[PDB]
Nucleic acid binder design. Sequence first.
DNA 1: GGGGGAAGGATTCA
DNA 2: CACGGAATCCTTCCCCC
Length: 341
Amino acid sequence: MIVLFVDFDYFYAQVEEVLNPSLKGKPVVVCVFSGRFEDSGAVATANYEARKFGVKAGIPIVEAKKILPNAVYLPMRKEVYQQVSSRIMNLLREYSEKIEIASIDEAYLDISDKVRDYREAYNLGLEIKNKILEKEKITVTVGISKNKVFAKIAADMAKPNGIKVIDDEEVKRLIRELDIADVPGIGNITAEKLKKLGINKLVDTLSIEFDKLKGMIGEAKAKYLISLARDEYNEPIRTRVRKSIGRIVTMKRNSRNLEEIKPYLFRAIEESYYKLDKRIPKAIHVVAVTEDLDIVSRGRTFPHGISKETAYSESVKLLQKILEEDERKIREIGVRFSKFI
DNA sequence: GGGGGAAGGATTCA
DNA sequence: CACGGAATCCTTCCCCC
Ligand SMILES: Nc1nc2c(ncn2[C@H]2C[C@H](O)[C@@H](COP(=O)(O)OP(=O)(O)OP(=O)(O)O)O2)c(=O)[nH]1
Ligand SMILES: [Ca+2]
Ligand SMILES: [Ca+2]
Ligand SMILES: [Ca+2]
């Protein structure tokens, strides 16, 4: 198997540049303005000019402002980025039927029976890059290896605007040298549990009793890590399909007042339905974010599809159930639909 | 004992 | 001060043969 992974560079910020070239060169910060107060909200991402000073995805807009008060701040326009993304995805399809769209800016191509050895794979990388850059003026980073995981690791290593191959030889090498935290799917929580077990590199998962590892991080995560340790990871490139659709909004102020909360909720329902289009869900969950930034939810699955009418009243109950099972005020309210017919 | 879901949360990544 | 969107996995509770 020969996997070629593509990851678009500082994607949202780069799209804003393509659409408004005068922005290129200076720091650009794409933000999610929550509407609470003046600059309430977080950063979705920022171009590298901005990252040089620590402004990156996830930090409060206010903190970014302190660092770069003169940077350009733009509201996130998700739908725009999506269409450009879709176009780039259609271009990659011209390189392989076997394609797995992982996110708005990521894709795995199974180019096994489309090229032999890594030399040809790499060159397919350059072609793909060059093509995308000429067709959409978007630079991306390419990662190539024997499976999705090391292909993605390949890309993380070459960012930004790069291309890299991790051949059968380096795969073996990284299994012994690569900090396990750098492995896709190992976040802060899992990294710490591994540390406390003494597991620092993929290789270490091989000398520990499975049941031990299993008990601390889960059977799934344990098999995953060992699988990679034994160069036995080979998940196929497959098409993914949306499984849930929803919306969540930040209220103007915290509240436990049903009447005060409902309009935001209903708004969340209306928007979610528009995004559902032809899809009919059988499950609905009401999601609330407490005053202390905590997340609580209540849902329900029906034996049939849910009409918008059924969503409204059912979602009101769930919200009442949330309020009557958690004393904290609510800060953000939303809904999610799943189990599509 | 264990097959088969469903509900609420944990964790991760974009 | 702390955004939106979403997938997979885990524990727990049920119903039943
Ligand atoms: N709203 C929101 N969107 C995010 C967040 N993180 C990532 N995104 C979106 C916008 C990013 O441009 C896009 C791609 O994510 P990456 O994790 O690939 O970041 P980006 O491509 O901007 O930079 P990169 O060159 O990959 O290091 O996903 C986030 O924390 N909040
Ligand atoms: Ca990216
Ligand atoms: Ca990405
Ligand atoms: Ca990590």
